[PDB]
Symmetry: C2
Subunit: 177 residues, 2 copies
Amino acid sequence: TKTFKTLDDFLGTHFIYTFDNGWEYEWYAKNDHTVDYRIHGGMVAGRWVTDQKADIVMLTEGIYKISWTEPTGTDVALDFMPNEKKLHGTIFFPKWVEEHPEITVTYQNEHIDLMEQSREKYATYPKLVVPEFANITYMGDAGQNNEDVISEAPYKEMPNDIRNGKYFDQNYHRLNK
Amino acid sequence: TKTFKTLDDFLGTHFIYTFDNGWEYEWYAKNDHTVDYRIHGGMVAGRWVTDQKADIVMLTEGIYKISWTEPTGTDVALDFMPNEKKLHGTIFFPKWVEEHPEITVTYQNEHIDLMEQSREKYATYPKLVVPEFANITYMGDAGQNNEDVISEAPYKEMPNDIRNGKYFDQNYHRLNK
C-alpha cells in the first residue's frame, strides 16, 4: 500500500467508504479543483454528480481537505486521512433536502435548474448537519481527469465490482461506456 | 513548546490567528461541544459569539476538526494544526451575510431572533464560500469552561493585550469583568 504525502499523491484517487450506519459513498478527486461522486446507500442512494467544482488543499503531510457547495444549497467539508483509511465528512443539508431527499436522487448534471428552483422554493432552516467518520474500503489510482470513473448511475453490486477488479480495465477505463 | 497529541490537549485552548489579507480572528475551544469566538478585522470586525454548539473531533494525532452552523445560516468547518501553528477554515456564508455583513456585527447572543429573521427575509444564494489558511499567532491554555476568555466586544489593541500578558491574570481570568 502506497503512502500519501503530497497533494499530487492524493489527486486522481478514487475512494469508496462506509459510515457507521452502513451507508456506502464514493468520491473521486478528478483534478485539483474538481470532484465527482456517487451515492450507494441511505437517504440519497442513487444520486451521482460529476464536475463539481471544489477547493482542495493539503492540510499537512497526508491529510487533505475538500470544500464545496451544491446546486441544492448543500455545503460539504471532507477531510481524507488515506494513510489511516479514514475520512471525516461534514454535510450541511438545507431543511428541504432532509424533507425531500428524493428530489436530489438523480444525475444532478441534467437537473441543475430543478435543484436551484427547489432551494429557493422550499425551506432552508433548520439545517441538518451530519459530521461523521467513515472507513475507506477502496482506494484506486484512477489518474487525473479520467471521465470513466464516475460515468453512470450506481447499481446494486457496483462497489463489489470495482473492488473485485471487474469494473475497470488495466488502464482504469470502462471497456463498455 | 507543548506538542498537541490528544483531543484533551486541544480542548481549552484559546487561539488568535491571521489570514493572508491581515484579518485577525479569535476562537476558543470551551469544551468538547462548545466554542466562543471574536472577530478583530475585516467583513465582520466587531462580531463576537459565546456558547456556539459545535462538533469537535480529532481527525488524527494533533489535528482537530470543528463543524458548526450559525443563527445567521452560516456554516463553518475549521481544521486546526496547532503543532504547525496553522489553521484552515471554510466559511459558507449565505448571500445576505455577504450583502449586509454589518447586521451580524454585534454580540450575537443578544440578537438571535434578529439573525433568524434576517436569514429567512433575505437571499441565501449564491453562497460566499471562503476556504483559507491562517497563521496562528497566539495559543493560550485557558482550561475548559472558562467564561472569561471571550466575555466582551473586541477593542483595537485587544490581541496585543492578550499576547503581551496584559489581559488575563495568572489563572487566565479577567481581573475586572
